Motif scaffolding. Structure first.
Motif, PDB file in Angstrom:
ATOM      1  N   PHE A 177       0.902  -1.157   0.000  1.00 37.85           N
ATOM      2  CA  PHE A 177       0.000   0.000   0.000  1.00 37.85           C
ATOM      3  C   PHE A 177       0.950   1.218   0.000  1.00 37.85           C
ATOM      4  CE2 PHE A 177      -2.275  -3.491   2.113  1.00 37.85           C
ATOM      5  CZ  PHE A 177      -3.532  -3.391   1.582  1.00 37.85           C
ATOM      6  N   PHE A 178       1.273   1.689  -1.153  1.00 36.02           N
ATOM      7  CA  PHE A 178       2.193   2.846  -1.320  1.00 36.02           C
ATOM      8  C   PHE A 178       1.541   4.065  -0.841  1.00 36.02           C
ATOM      9  CE2 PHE A 178       4.043   6.241  -4.158  1.00 36.02           C
ATOM     10  CZ  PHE A 178       5.269   6.289  -3.525  1.00 36.02           C
ATOM     11  N   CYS A 179       2.250   4.907  -0.112  1.00 35.44           N
ATOM     12  CA  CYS A 179       1.606   5.995   0.569  1.00 35.44           C
ATOM     13  C   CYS A 179       1.201   7.204  -0.194  1.00 35.44           C
ATOM     14  CB  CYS A 179       2.426   6.382   1.816  1.00 35.44           C
ATOM     15  SG  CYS A 179       3.819   7.394   1.449  1.00 35.44           S
ATOM     16  N   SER A 180       1.791   7.386  -1.325  1.00 35.72           N
ATOM     17  CA  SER A 180       1.707   8.526  -2.255  1.00 35.72           C
ATOM     18  C   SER A 180       3.062   9.226  -2.388  1.00 35.72           C
ATOM     19  CB  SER A 180       0.661   9.576  -1.927  1.00 35.72           C
ATOM     20  OG  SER A 180       0.859  10.630  -2.848  1.00 35.72           O
ATOM     21  N   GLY A 181       3.422   9.522  -3.605  1.00 33.51           N
ATOM     22  CA  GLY A 181       4.619  10.289  -3.892  1.00 33.51           C
ATOM     23  C   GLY A 181       4.399  11.479  -4.842  1.00 33.51           C
ATOM     24  N   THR A 182       3.198  11.984  -4.957  1.00 33.03           N
ATOM     25  CA  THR A 182       2.905  13.113  -5.772  1.00 33.03           C
ATOM     26  C   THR A 182       3.271  14.397  -5.096  1.00 33.03           C
ATOM     27  OG1 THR A 182       0.692  13.276  -4.889  1.00 33.03           O
ATOM     28  CG2 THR A 182       0.960  11.889  -6.894  1.00 33.03           C
ATOM     29  N   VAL A 183       3.595  15.398  -5.884  1.00 33.51           N
ATOM     30  CA  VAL A 183       3.798  16.757  -5.295  1.00 33.51           C
ATOM     31  C   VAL A 183       2.513  17.407  -4.826  1.00 33.51           C
ATOM     32  CG1 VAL A 183       4.701  19.106  -5.632  1.00 33.51           C
ATOM     33  CG2 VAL A 183       5.950  17.019  -6.568  1.00 33.51           C
ATOM     34  N   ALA A 184       1.494  17.344  -5.671  1.00 42.24           N
ATOM     35  CA  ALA A 184       0.146  17.790  -5.327  1.00 42.24           C
ATOM     36  C   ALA A 184       0.213  19.203  -4.784  1.00 42.24           C
ATOM     37  CB  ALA A 184      -0.512  16.742  -4.369  1.00 42.24           C
ATOM     38  N   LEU A 185      -0.282  19.469  -3.593  1.00 43.54           N
ATOM     39  CA  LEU A 185      -0.365  20.863  -3.092  1.00 43.54           C
ATOM     40  C   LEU A 185       0.882  21.318  -2.366  1.00 43.54           C
ATOM     41  CD1 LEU A 185      -3.959  20.839  -1.550  1.00 43.54           C
ATOM     42  CD2 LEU A 185      -3.233  21.506  -3.852  1.00 43.54           C
ATOM     43  N   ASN A 186       1.899  20.450  -2.241  1.00 41.63           N
ATOM     44  CA  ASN A 186       3.023  20.756  -1.345  1.00 41.63           C
ATOM     45  C   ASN A 186       3.931  21.810  -1.977  1.00 41.63           C
ATOM     46  OD1 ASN A 186       2.359  18.958   0.687  1.00 41.63           O
ATOM     47  ND2 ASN A 186       3.472  17.219  -0.273  1.00 41.63           N
ATOM     48  N   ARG A 187       4.479  22.623  -1.121  1.00 36.02           N
ATOM     49  CA  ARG A 187       5.492  23.592  -1.486  1.00 36.02           C
ATOM     50  C   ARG A 187       6.858  22.906  -1.240  1.00 36.02           C
ATOM     51  NH1 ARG A 187       2.242  26.691   1.967  1.00 36.02           N
ATOM     52  NH2 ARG A 187       3.981  26.599   3.446  1.00 36.02           N
ATOM     53  N   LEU A 188       7.775  22.968  -2.217  1.00 34.78           N
ATOM     54  CA  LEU A 188       9.061  22.316  -2.203  1.00 34.78           C
ATOM     55  C   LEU A 188      10.187  23.288  -1.828  1.00 34.78           C
ATOM     56  CD1 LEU A 188       8.646  20.051  -5.339  1.00 34.78           C
ATOM     57  CD2 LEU A 188       8.316  19.411  -2.956  1.00 34.78           C
ATOM     58  N   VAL A 189       9.982  24.572  -2.092  1.00 33.79           N
ATOM     59  CA  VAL A 189      11.024  25.613  -1.965  1.00 33.79           C
ATOM     60  C   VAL A 189      10.349  26.896  -1.584  1.00 33.79           C
ATOM     61  CG1 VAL A 189      12.827  24.578  -3.399  1.00 33.79           C
ATOM     62  CG2 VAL A 189      11.085  25.998  -4.466  1.00 33.79           C
ATOM     63  N   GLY A 190      11.100  27.858  -1.089  1.00 34.29           N
ATOM     64  CA  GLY A 190      10.552  29.158  -0.701  1.00 34.29           C
ATOM     65  C   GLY A 190      10.243  29.063   0.779  1.00 34.29           C
ATOM     66  N   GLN A 191       8.985  28.694   1.087  1.00 36.11           N
ATOM     67  CA  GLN A 191       8.577  28.242   2.437  1.00 36.11           C
ATOM     68  C   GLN A 191       8.096  26.812   2.305  1.00 36.11           C
ATOM     69  OE1 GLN A 191       9.961  31.418   3.856  1.00 36.11           O
ATOM     70  NE2 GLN A 191       8.570  30.552   5.417  1.00 36.11           N
ATOM     71  N   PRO A 192       9.035  25.862   2.348  1.00 38.64           N
ATOM     72  CA  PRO A 192       8.605  24.469   2.114  1.00 38.64           C
ATOM     73  C   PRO A 192       7.547  24.009   3.103  1.00 38.64           C
ATOM     74  CG  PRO A 192      11.003  24.684   2.117  1.00 38.64           C
ATOM     75  CD  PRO A 192      10.470  25.947   2.606  1.00 38.64           C
ATOM     76  N   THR A 193       6.697  23.100   2.608  1.00 35.11           N
ATOM     77  CA  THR A 193       5.578  22.612   3.425  1.00 35.11           C
ATOM     78  C   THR A 193       6.044  22.021   4.742  1.00 35.11           C
ATOM     79  OG1 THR A 193       4.050  22.318   1.610  1.00 35.11           O
ATOM     80  CG2 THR A 193       3.912  20.673   3.501  1.00 35.11           C
ATOM     81  N   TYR A 194       7.212  21.362   4.744  1.00 31.69           N
ATOM     82  CA  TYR A 194       7.886  21.011   5.999  1.00 31.69           C
ATOM     83  C   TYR A 194       9.409  20.889   5.756  1.00 31.69           C
ATOM     84  CZ  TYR A 194       8.217  16.125   4.529  1.00 31.69           C
ATOM     85  OH  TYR A 194       8.545  14.950   3.836  1.00 31.69           O
ATOM     86  N   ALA A 195      10.219  20.915   6.813  1.00 29.31           N
ATOM     87  CA  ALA A 195      11.638  20.906   6.655  1.00 29.31           C
ATOM     88  C   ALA A 195      12.132  19.582   6.100  1.00 29.31           C
ATOM     89  CB  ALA A 195      12.292  21.182   8.024  1.00 29.31           C
ATOM     90  N   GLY A 196      12.914  19.651   5.036  1.00 28.27           N
ATOM     91  CA  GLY A 196      13.544  18.458   4.513  1.00 28.27           C
ATOM     92  C   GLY A 196      12.721  17.740   3.503  1.00 28.27           C
ATOM     93  N   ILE A 197      11.648  18.373   3.061  1.00 20.87           N
ATOM     94  CA  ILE A 197      10.740  17.739   2.084  1.00 20.87           C
ATOM     95  C   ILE A 197      11.373  17.257   0.791  1.00 20.87           C
ATOM     96  CG2 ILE A 197       9.826  19.949   1.198  1.00 20.87           C
ATOM     97  CD1 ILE A 197       7.060  18.685   0.974  1.00 20.87           C
ATOM     98  N   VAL A 198      12.234  18.075   0.185  1.00 26.18           N
ATOM     99  CA  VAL A 198      12.838  17.683  -1.083  1.00 26.18           C
ATOM    100  C   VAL A 198      13.672  16.402  -0.915  1.00 26.18           C
ATOM    101  CG1 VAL A 198      14.537  18.266  -2.845  1.00 26.18           C
ATOM    102  CG2 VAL A 198      12.793  19.943  -2.100  1.00 26.18           C
TER     103      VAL A 198
END
Ligand SMILES: [Zn+2]
Ligand SMILES: [Zn+2]
Ligand SMILES: [Zn+2]
Length: 272
Positions: A177-198
């Protein structure tokens, strides 16, 4: 977000008839959100829920197969976004089940919010307490059935992919059951959605490509092309959900899309 919400009142709420997918794993989701019941010898495991407004629909689907919602002992989460958690607080209270989720998603679950967008009420969901916070390699057992947690963060900080063994005839097959790996609504840079996301996303793609998985599942049926497989399913024909190359192919597609979105979001940092 507007389009996210549009999809969430369209394919994500549309019916789909529940079915036995393989062995003791049953599909009970919608046409656009995948939800599973895992039948064990000591009760049921529910894998995710759907949008908050769809809980009655998911419970009805469980019933269509003759399972009893009352018999749910454990609720497992892939990741803590409202389209997967919307029914947790309700089903947990009705059943007394325990909620099991990845440790880094505990704050999300317990606060009912989207990380990095906590004031967005349209992405909120009823808050729920986590009974067991899991880490990589933890084993969750109910009766005859054991699932193993794999830490696959990125789409959420505590995104957990769950592995289990099933039978196909006399042979073992490995399910993820793969959890999901899409970017979708997440912010990757600037103010990332959480620390270490990339770094988490790219670690997860690599991890996914290294796993030996016979049957890829996920929290939306497009992860694994569920509808095309369900249409091919015939008593006395191979189970179409067995496609051992699929997680590598899919994670390769996700990585390519990731690169495109990281480049788009990086370009967008340049303030005009
Ligand atoms: Zn999500
Ligand atoms: Zn989702
Ligand atoms: Zn692992």
């Amino acid at each position: 977000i507007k389009d996210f919400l549009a999809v969430a009142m369209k394919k994500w709420t549309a019916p789909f008839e529940p079915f036995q997918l393989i062995d003791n794993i049953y599909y009970v989701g919608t046409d656009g959100i995948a939800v599973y019941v895992i039948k064990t010898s000591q009760g049921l495991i529910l894998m995710d829920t759907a949008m908050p407004q769809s809980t009655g629909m998911i419970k009805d689907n469980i019933a269509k197969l003759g399972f009893k919602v009352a018999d749910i002992k454990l609720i497992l989460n892939t990741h803590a976004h409202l389209d997967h958690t919307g029914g947790f607080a309700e089903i947990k209270k009705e059943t007394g089940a325990q909620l099991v989720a990845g440790e880094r998603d505990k704050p999300l679950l317990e606060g009912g919010y989207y990380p990095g967008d906590e004031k967005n009420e349209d992405l909120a969901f009823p808050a729920v307490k986590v009974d067991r916070a899991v880490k990589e390699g933890d084993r969750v057992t109910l009766g005859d059935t054991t699932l193993t947690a794999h830490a696959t963060p990125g789409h959420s900080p505590g995104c957990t992919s769950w592995e289990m063994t099933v039978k196909d005839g006399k042979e073992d097959r490995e399910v993820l059951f793969f959890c999901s790996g899409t970017v979708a609504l997440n912010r990757l840079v600037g103010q990332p959605t959480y620390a270490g996301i990339v770094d988490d996303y790219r670690a997860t793609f690599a991890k996914a490509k290294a796993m030996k998985i016979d049957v890829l599942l996920g929290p939306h049926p497009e992860v694994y092309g569920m509808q095309a497989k369900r249409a091919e399913m015939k008593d006395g024909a191979p189970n179409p959900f067995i496609k051992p190359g699929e997680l590598v192919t899919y994670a390769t597609s996700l990585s390519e899309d990731f690169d495109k979105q990281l480049a788009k979001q990086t370009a967008a940092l340049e303030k005009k």
